[PDB]
Design a protein around this ligand. Structure first.
Ligand code: FMN
Ligand code: FMN
Lengths: 176, 175
């Protein structure tokens, strides 16, 4: 990687959630890169227990809209619905790695979108069963998360000032 | 940077590393990894995680029985990512602990990679024993462990890189 490139300052910290978008169409090659990032993500046992359902045509976007009650949601040009396949995900305890593995793919895709100058927001506040009904999703697959993305409106600042807990609050060394 | 590509030049150069050399991990590098976790996004920004670092001999030895994999006791540093079910955002009968802790884990895995370190994401460990050993409160779960250090450059990846094709994993508009 470049000599002076810092992942934190130059890349992670420059990404804020974007909920307000302009009309500029997203280039095909940029959408394909985002999807490639998801495809190459690691997973437990490399089972890749995900499927990416892209919704960007008007009919599909309109169908998806009723799954959310957040006013900003229907304004996103592109949605990537990340489906987790319980039949394919590694088992642990009485559950599985669907939430873990899909979230790695979502993180890769979010970061890839950011690297290509797009804005996005990760969405989990939606009616999953309704999503499954509308898109004929098999019972054994769950829509876990949706990446809502497009070109951000540059006149709209981040929703609030950046805030996180202190490093002293979130880290313990050796013992809690 | 001009022709720095996140996929070709960063994601694809990372493979899981399970075999490590003795070189100590610099404090500044460990702190950067933890900073990457801290600044990760999370549902409702609730940040329902806690990072338990285990790198001293007593701790590393105490943790070892939680893993059955031969390579695991070779890792110099473990970051045990705890998820807090009380604080995590709620959906249906569940919560975002596995989602959120995994975003933080991904940020830390990627940070380690950017700093010249090797690591492996570990979920195959005895979570109940881990909770007992480290007195983890009942409302918190150890979800994942990032095992990290300087990789042995003489050891290749465990297997050749393989993923499903793009056509297998993507559908446009309908399944
Ligand atoms: C959620 C998750 C859990 C994993 N758990 C383990 C583990 O317990 N032990 C192990 O040896 N590898 C584990 N891995 C590493 C995977 O085997 C590895 O990421 C996968 O085979 C893809 O290979 P790559 O990381 O080299 O691209 C885990 C990876 C993920 C993402
Ligand atoms: C797992 C997850 C689910 C999220 N769900 C939503 C959502 O349903 N609606 C929304 O407006 N924002 C959602 N967010 C965006 C968060 O509000 C945002 O990431 C957080 O406040 C931190 O802000 P930042 O992303 O600008 O750093 C979600 C984020 C994550 C990581």
């Amino acid at each position: 990687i470049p000599q002076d490139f810092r992942l934190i300052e130059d890349f992670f910290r420059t990404r804020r959630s974007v909920r307000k978008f302009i009309d500029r169409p997203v280039e095909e090659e940029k959408l394909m890169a985002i999807l490639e990032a998801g495809r190459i993500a690691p997973s437990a046992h490399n089972y890749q227990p995900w499927h990416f359902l892209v919704v960007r045509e008007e009919e599909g976007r309109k169908r998806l809209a009723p799954c959310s009650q957040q006013p900003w949601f229907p304004g996103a040009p592109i949605y990537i619905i990340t489906l987790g396949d319980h039949q394919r995900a590694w088992k642990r305890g009485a559950g599985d790695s669907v939430d873990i593995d899909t979230s790695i793919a979502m993180t890769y895709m979010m970061l890839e979108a950011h690297s290509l100058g797009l804005g996005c927001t990760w969405v989990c506040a939606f009616d999953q069963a309704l999503c499954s009904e509308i898109f004929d999703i098999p019972s054994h697959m769950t829509p876990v998360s949706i990446l809502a993305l497009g070109y951000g409106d540059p006149t709209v600042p981040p929703r609030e000032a950046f805030n996180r807990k202190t490093i002293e609050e979130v880290v313990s060394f050796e013992k809690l």
